[PDB]
Amino acid sequence: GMQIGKIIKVSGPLVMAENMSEASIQDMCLVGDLGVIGEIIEMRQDVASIQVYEETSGIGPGEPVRSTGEALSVELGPGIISQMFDGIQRPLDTFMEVTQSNFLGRGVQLPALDHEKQWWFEATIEEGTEVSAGDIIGYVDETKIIQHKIMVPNGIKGTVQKIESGSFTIDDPICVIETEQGLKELTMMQKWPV
Amino acid sequence: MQIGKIIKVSGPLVMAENMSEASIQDMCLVGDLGVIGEIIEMRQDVASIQVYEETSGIGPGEPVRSTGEALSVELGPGIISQMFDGIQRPLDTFMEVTQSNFLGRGVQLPALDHEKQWWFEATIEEGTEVSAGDIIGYVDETKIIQHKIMVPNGIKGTVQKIESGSFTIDDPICVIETEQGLKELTMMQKWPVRRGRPIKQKLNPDVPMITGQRVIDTFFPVTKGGAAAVPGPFGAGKTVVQHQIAKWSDVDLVVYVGCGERGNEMTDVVNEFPELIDPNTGESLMERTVLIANTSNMPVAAREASIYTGITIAEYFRDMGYDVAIMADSTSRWAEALREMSGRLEEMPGDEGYPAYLGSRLAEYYERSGRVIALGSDQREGSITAISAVSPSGGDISEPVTQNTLRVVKVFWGLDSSLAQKRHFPSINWIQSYSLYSTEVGRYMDQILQWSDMVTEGMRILQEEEQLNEIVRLVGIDSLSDNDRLTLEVAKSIREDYLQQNAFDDVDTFTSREKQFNMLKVILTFGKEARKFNEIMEGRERISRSKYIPLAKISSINEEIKE
Amino acid sequence: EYRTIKEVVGPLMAVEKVSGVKYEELIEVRMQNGEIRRGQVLEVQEDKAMVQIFEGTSGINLKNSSVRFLGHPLQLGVSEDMIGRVFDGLGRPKDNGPEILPEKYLDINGEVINPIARDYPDEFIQTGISAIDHLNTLVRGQKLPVFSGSGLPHKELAAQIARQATVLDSSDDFAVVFAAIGITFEEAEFFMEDFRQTGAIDRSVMFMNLANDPAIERIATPRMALTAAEYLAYEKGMHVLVIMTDMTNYAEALREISAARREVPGRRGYPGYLYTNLATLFERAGRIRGLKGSVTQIPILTMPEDDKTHPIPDLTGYITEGQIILTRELYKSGIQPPIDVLPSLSRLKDKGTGAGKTREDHAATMNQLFAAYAQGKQAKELAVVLGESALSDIDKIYAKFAERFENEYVNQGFYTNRTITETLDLGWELLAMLPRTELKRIKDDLLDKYLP
Amino acid sequence: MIKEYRTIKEVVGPLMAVEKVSGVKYEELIEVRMQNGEIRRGQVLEVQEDKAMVQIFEGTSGINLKNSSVRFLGHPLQLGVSEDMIGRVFDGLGRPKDNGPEILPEKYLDINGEVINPIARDYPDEFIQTGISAIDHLNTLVRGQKLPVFSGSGLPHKELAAQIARQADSSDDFAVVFAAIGITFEEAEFFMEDFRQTGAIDRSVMFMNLANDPAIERIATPRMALTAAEYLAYEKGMHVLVIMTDMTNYAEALREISAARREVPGRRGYPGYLYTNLATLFERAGRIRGLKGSVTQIPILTMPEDDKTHPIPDLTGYITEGQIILTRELYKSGIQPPIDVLPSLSRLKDKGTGAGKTREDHAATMNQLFAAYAQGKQAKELAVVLGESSDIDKIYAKFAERFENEYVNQGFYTNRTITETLDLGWELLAMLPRTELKRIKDDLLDKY
Amino acid sequence: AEEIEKTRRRVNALEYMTIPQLEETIYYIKMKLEENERAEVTRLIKVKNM
Secondary structure, rough: OOOEEEEEEEEEEEEEOOOOOOOEEEEEEEEEOOOOEEEEEEEOEEEEEEEEEEEEOOOOOOEEEEEEEEOOOEEEEOOOOOOEEOOOEEEEEHHHHHHOOEEEEOOOOOOOOOOOOOOOOEEOOOOOOOOOOOEEEEEEOOOOOOEEEEEEOOOEEEEEEEEEEEOOOOOOOEEEEEOOOOEEEEOEEEEEEO | OOEEEEEEEEEOOOEEOOOOOOOOOEEEEEEOOOOOOOOOEEOOOEEEEEEOOOOOOOOOOOOOEEEEOOEEEOOOOOOOOOOOOOOOHHHHHHHHHHHEEEEEOOOOOOOHHHHHOEEEOOOOOOEEEEEOOOOEEEEEEOOOOEEEEEEEOOOOOOEEEEEEEEEEOOOEEEEEEEEEEEEOEEEEEEOOOEEEEEEEEEEOOOOOOOOOOHEEEEEOOOOOEEEEEEEEOOOOOOHHHHHHHHHHHOEEEEEEEEOOOOOHHHHHHHHHHHHOOOOOOOEHHHHHEEEEEEEOOOOOHHHHHHHHHHHHHHHHHHHOOOOOEEEEEEHHHHHHHHHHHHHHOOEOOHHOOOOOHHHHHHHHHHOOOEEEEEEEOOOEEEEEEEEEEEEEEOOOOOOHHHHHHHHHOOOOOOHHHHHHHHOOOEEEEOOOHHHOOHHHHHHHHHHHHHOOHHHHHHHHHHHHHHHHHHHHHOOOOOOOOHHHHHHHHHHHHHHHHHHOOOOOOOOOOOHHHHHHHHHHHHHHHHHHHOOOOOHHHOOOOOHOOHHOOOOOHHHHHHHHHHO | OOOOOOEEEOOEEEEOHHHHEEOEEEEEOOOOOOOEEEEEEEEEEOOOOOEEEEEEEEEEOOOOOOOEEOOOOOEEOOOOOOEEEEOOOOEEEOOOOOOOOOOOOEEEEOOOOOOOOEEEEEEEEEEEOOOHOOOOEEEEEEEEEEOOOOOOOOHHHHHHHHHHHHOOOOOOEEEEEEEEEEEEEHHHHHHHHHHHHOHHHEEEEEEEEEEEOHHHHHHHHEEEEEHHHHHHHHHOOOEEEEEEEEEEHHHHHHHHHHHHHOOOOOHHOOOOOHHHHHHHHHHHOOOEEEOOOOOEEEEEEEEHOOOOHHHHHHHHHHHEEEEEEEEEHHHOOOOOOOEOOOOOEEEOOHHHHOOOOOOOOHHHHHHHHHHHHHHHHHHHHHHHHHHOOOOHHHHHHHHHHHHHHHHHHHOOOOOOOOOOOHHHHHHHHHOOOOOOOOOOOOOHHHHHHHHH | OOOOOOEEEEEEEOEEEOOOOOOOOOOOEEEEEEEEEEEEEEEEEEEEEEEEEEEEEEOOOOOOOOEEEEEEEEEEEEEEEEEHHOOOOEOOOOOEOOOOOOOOOOOEEEOOOOOOOOOOOOOEEEEEEOOOOOHOOOOOEEEOEEEEEEEOOOHHHHHHHHHHHHHHHOOOOEEEEEEEEOOOOOHHHHHHHHHHHHHHHHHEEEEEEEHHHHOOHHOOOHHHHHHHHHHHOOOOOEEEEEEEOOOOHHHHHHHHHHHOOOOEEEHHOOOOOOOHHHHHOOOOOOOOOOOEEEEEEEEEOOOHHOOOHHHHHHHHHHHHOEEEEEEEHHHHHHOOOOEEOOOOOEOOOOOOOOOOOOOOOHHHHHHHHHHHHHHHHHHHHHHHHHHHHHHHHHHHHHHHHHHHHHHHHOOOOOOHHHHHHHHHHHHHOOOOOOOHHOOOOOOHHHHH | OHHHHHHHHHHHHHHHHHHHHHHHHHHHHHHHHHHHHHHHHHHHHHHHHH
16 A cells, blocks of 8 residues: 565665665555564655564565565554464464464464454443543453553544444454544454553 | 876875776886886776875876786895885896986886896606696705796696797797697796785694794694794784794795885895704805795885785795795784775774775785695695784784784784893793794694603793792792792793794704703703702702703703702 | 665765665676676665675775665575585585585575464483583483683584484484684684594584675674574474584674674673573574474684673573683693583483483482582692691592592583483492592482492 | 876865866876965775866865866875985975985885785894893883884873984984874974984984874874885995884874765774775885895874773784883873883894894893792782782782882983893892792793 | 781771772772763764764
């Protein structure tokens, strides 16, 4: 959706890419065909200077750079408890299962939480209620001990229009809010920059 | 064909365009004067040139010509007993040609006398299959050193014609039938100083050198093919140590390189060496010595050249089956030449401004030393022993030259200013110094003499004295037991009666293996018997003066001690 | 093929009209005289690439020489037939033995082990050296480095460890991968000759890089060795001991290439990314869940000016599970190996010791020996400060304990192979010098079973 | 055809850049003709394409770029030499400063001079009696040697230097070349006064750069001096003594230019070429086979922060043939001269001393005195910390005291014969038990 | 009493001279090392830009 960059310089851990003018400072990027983890440190015109955090052996000019559109963030929602991540929220359990290897291959990118697991959402707010950030619209009994409270995300303010209990994944819209900017949909997951 | 033109001058660094025919490391004649230089860099058609002479008065628009050949040395009869500058120019012929006592610019003189007649004695039969290193004959360059004429590298075939006779080094003395046609050979070969002369096999240096200097031969020994570094502050007796090794070592030839140092020291060597006569031979030490001189006020870039010139000549003699010692004094001035050039190339410097490739350069030099089997059907055994002075500022051995050196050499003779000031010579710090050959030399000595234990015990006493003195300095000699007082007396004896040695005393200047054994035996004996305090001490002068004995007068001391 | 050399500045050279060129890609230079030299891309731009020639740039005519880009970085051709063979830093035959047909070619950087997929070190490794096995135990899968110094005998200790290392029972023997980094010929020959003279070469794969080899070869060496080790271990199910000396030479090589790319140094003149670099190397080790084989690592490094705060030993300590320390004071006294147990540490030691693993009295005797040693050294110092007058009867014993401990226990010799049993027994004979009253860290149950 | 361009591009401190030039050479001497007609000399540091970067000796203050010109004089910096130089005083750039006649020069010399062929060198071994015991006996000065004085701010190095020049089998004298380098008025005036009073001024050539003179000038001054010296020695067969103070100010000037040029720095911001640069001065000394003259050097430098490891004294020491060190400790005790003989050295004492040169007892007594003094100085330092009360070390402590007070301390106007010095040394050795005199063999002990 | 006094002098030499001299020197070295390393990296960044 945002413009894909082209590498113009690989020098040790430092990569430069042009056509990056729609990306932002501190954005996380996938560098090269391989798509290794990097971060945009500088910008001169359309040329971004990128620190690459994985081995840059084998990467060269020509290859693509894709920005992730955001700075380093966490996915927050049901399925975060009892999980073991690395520093950038890579799901270590999932890595084993999916890639079928003992290793974290360069270029392998997997979602932090499980976007396919069904959860029972229990609605505790009825329709027509005025809400803002922090208000609890319901809960999911996530683990054997902890009850995961589903809150109205930051930057959402308005009136609850449609909401009901049921089974959903963390990608399904469980709520409709009538805000100043119009009708918006909520899911059980929110993102936040660390 | 092509003539370059200068487009920049900045000290010893000169840039010339239109040099596209030339190659990296080519020697060149720079400017109207035709001063001698070397191409180090090439950007498009613009060559960066390092000049080995002063570049004052030189500037843009002057011509530059490449010679097409890298910096090389002439290797043949007439090389022994001369003195050359850093790039193997004869300093005496220089004097005769220019008729001057001073060193001027732009004169290109051949290294050797190409007109001098030698008797070539052919030793090889016609029809023989030969290759590199094979001896075809010899010349008596001195009364003892046979200058063996070898088949140069890159020559291979059958000897077609050869005969004894009187020739110059330019006359054809041999024709070999090669796959590249008939090729004529002279007594002389040229070789690039930055390339190691090839060998068949590198071997382990396991025969100890006899230096005759007690502290070295006993505690920090060097083998034939070994490499030793002597880092020391100024005024530590830097020079005398090297002179002693040069004059007393049992090698066949000595290559002495005065690198960025005082001119008067070169003058001293050429005056003293011819006067030092081997009594078993009757000829002087100069008749087995080659001198390379590039003084501290001679052109900077030529310091590097003197180092490589020296090692290449040593490898040439090595290839004949000879044991050679090369003296580099001092390596620090070489490293500073790298640093000045690095600065001028605006390279990213490493520690103290020295280039990032410093460790690697030193490694390349010392890896050229060593014991080898030379090329040739004979498989002759030969070796190069490297003795290098290092000059760390203030005697701080943490500096990059000393430190990178000690990662590639095997012997460390740390000179000490504290010892020097109280006139303890050679001022070798016995706690700081070490030899990675100690173990092997110990085995050898044990066998030859029928010693290892005594050297271990001697060092252990010295180490113990050191640990005791750490306390006495910050507490006082007050509460010392009789045992500790005895230890300090034994260590005193080792230091004053054995370690201390005057190079200027007629007798003390050299100590044989056997005399060394008897002296250490006597010292340890007193310690052992006394161990078995004020009482014993008041009842050792004979031990103190053992070093002056020309052998039964030393061995007999053991019985006087015990009684 | 490219006839497009634009610049030559030292061993570095800039090549134009490139495309599809990658960082660290291998290159080949065909000189005007037909001679062939190889190199590696140190940096690459749109128009050009910067390369360093392994053999140097002497005698190269730019206009008339050519460059060819191989399409790949350095790679190791793996095979079980590597065992008993000697290669150089770049994996090229050194022993002139028969040709190897590789099963597969691998890049030498490795992949990082999923932190949850690593298994805990369990098995005791008998090195045969009391001061290690007993006091600073090496466990299968650990990274336990030796901190040495210029003119310390880490050479002899490295040879001894490779020689004597074994795991009790198992049937499965140890395959040893030995990487020599930037060492002198004389030292390389010692290692190769010791491996041959003892038959240990039949268990080993050797990668020998010398002091006069290029800096980029020295950088490649550890990576070649570890790629071979992970293949033998994780793909073939072997138990692998990796020994590498000298790590300091590896670090110096980094600085050389870093300066060639005009990078501004970090702390004390080393690259800022030294941590990442060393951590990537040393963590290529340990057990893996579900897999039979393992990698155990013993990096050896010399400490510049004998300084443990130096970036090289300082960062290594942050990565490795402890360190074995050799000292000048012990060596000057003739103690072989000169291991100083007081600053030495193994962080995984409690996992490879006790009943089943060694013997029940392992832990207790270690604590006791450590404490009496420190106490005895204090007593020796007391005698020097205040005289033999000030020593009690118990104190005279501790002083004598520390003396014997250095001389008979630590000082075993570079060719002495002590079994754990022999070592523990010798510890008890030295602890027997002390009255029952002094042996506090040992419960009377085991004190009555073992004390002579 | 006079080479002059009115194309000055930029002026930055002591550096100026000129463009659209041709045929300009490295190190070529230049003259800037300012808009007001003031003339200031300079030196080409760098030439590339049609540009030249030049350093201005007298600075660039008040210069108008447009209306100034640069003349290029077709030769490097030179000294006009003559026997007529004797008794004359010049400035830092070699211009007469005494309002006497202009010299009609016998020739011009490039002040960079030339390297003497190593094989042409004659080894210096001619004993020079300075009359100073600490020097004559222990740190012996020979004719052709380079032996510097290492001092510090506010120490009497000027007194020592003047005494040596005053007092140093023949009725040969020394022609003295004296270089003032960034020294204050009062420091320079001390020499002028001493030279005039002793009449030595009539044997002297002086080159004066003072603290208020432009600093870039000082890079030339000692080269000027040494060119004068080697001229009088090798072309006019004289014995020349060269005294230069303060060498430290020379090095500071080198650093100023090196900073201006944005060079890659060495230790302490001193340029990487410091050793080489200093060597080009100090190696201008010695003797030549077959030539009657000689050059003897006594450079004087103050050790900054009294630190012997400072690049200036350290590198100097690596070049010169020993050093004479003055200390603030000995100076505060009123020792004159305040010479610390323990860190002092002479590298050419061996071949200049002994029977038929000084006396047969020279070398032996020197070594025994050094060893006795080092042990006595150690015992004094012990007694000051642990108290006055071994029996033998107490003897050494008294020796070191008598040695400093009676042997080293003699006064700046006391001129002792070598015999008097050696005999006095024996009087001090007589304090020690004969058993302790282990550096001296039986034959010398029995005799003296 | 004599032994007491001789012990006392050694104690006071350490307490008022030896130890403080070592403390002051350690402080000095430590500072000077620190200063030079900052100056060194400053120059490297300058040489970098050249």
